[PDB]
Amino acid sequence: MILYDLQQNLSSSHRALEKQIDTLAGKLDALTELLSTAL
Amino acid sequence: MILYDLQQNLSSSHRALEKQIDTLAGKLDALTELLSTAL
Amino acid sequence: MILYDLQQNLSSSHRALEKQIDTLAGKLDALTELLSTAL
Amino acid sequence: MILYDLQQNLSSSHRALEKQIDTLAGKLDALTELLSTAL
Ligand SMILES: [Cu+2]
């Protein structure tokens, strides 16, 4: 068990979460455009 | 305290967060369908 | 530095993130009700 | 590898995720205002 690897694994997991939330942000931007042009 | 267990616990916590965000994504897809057919 | 404390701190941080995402989920449920009755 | 640094790095990563989710919350508040005045 290399603590350094553990740190790299955790950072990789946090990066994945970040990207997921970012795609959720884009879906909300998408919705807001849908409404902004229709309404 | 087994560092390996600590790593498995952290990975399990990150997996749970991922699934939670995924369900939030599905709720937004749901909303976007609601509006897309009504509007 | 007690690895056990480190684990409890991390779990507490993940719990806080979970609750935050949960409140975001509730805001989306709120929006979906707003639209579902108006539309 | 200083376990303390590892802890500070993890806390910094969790803080970044928190702020990201917070900005997503603000985008949803923004959308809800858009609809609340138009509808
Ligand atoms: Cu984490």
Author numbering:
A (entry chain A), B (entry chain A), C (entry chain A), D (entry chain A): 376 to 414
Quote the paper:
KCa2.1, KCa2.2, KCa2.3, and KCa3.1, also known as SK1–4 (or SK1–3 and IK1), are small- (KCa2.1–2.3) or intermediate-conductance (KCa3.1) potassium channels encoded by the KCNN genes. These homotetrameric potassium channels constitutively bind the calcium-binding protein calmodulin (CaM) in their cytoplasmic regions, and calcium binding to channel-associated CaM is thought to induce a conformational change that leads to channel opening. By effluxing potassium ions, KCa3.1 maintains a negative membrane potential necessary for sustained calcium influx via calcium release-activated channels (CRACs) and for subsequent cytokine production. The cytoplasmic domain contains a CaM-binding region followed by a predicted coiled-coil region near the C-terminus, which is important for proper processing and trafficking of the channel.
To characterize structurally the C-terminal coiled-coil region in KCa3.1 (KCa3.1-CC), we determined its crystal structure at 1.75-Å resolution. The structure reveals a parallel four-helix bundle, consistent with the tetrameric nature of the channel. The space group of the tetragonal crystals is P4212, and the asymmetric unit comprises two KCa3.1-CC molecules. In the structure of copper-containing KCa3.1-CC, the crystallographic four-fold axis generates two parallel four-helix bundles comprising four (identical) copies of each of the two KCa3.1-CC protomers in the asymmetric unit. The packing within the crystal is diagrammed in S1 Fig. The root-mean-square deviation (rmsd) of Cα atoms (residues 378–411) for the two copies of KCa3.1-CC in the asymmetric unit is 0.49 Å. As expected, based on coiled-coil prediction software, His389 occupies an inward-facing ‘a’ position in the heptad repeat of the coiled-coil/four-helix bundle. In the copper-containing structure, a copper ion is positioned on the four-fold axis, ligated by the NE2 nitrogen atom (also known as N3) of the imidazole ring from each of the four copies of His389, with an N3-Cu distance of 2.1 Å. An axial water molecule, at 2.5 Å on the N-terminal side, completes the square-pyramidal coordination. Based on the coordination geometry, the copper ion is Cu(II). In the partially refined apo structure, the side chain of His389 points away from the center of the four-helix bundle (data not shown).
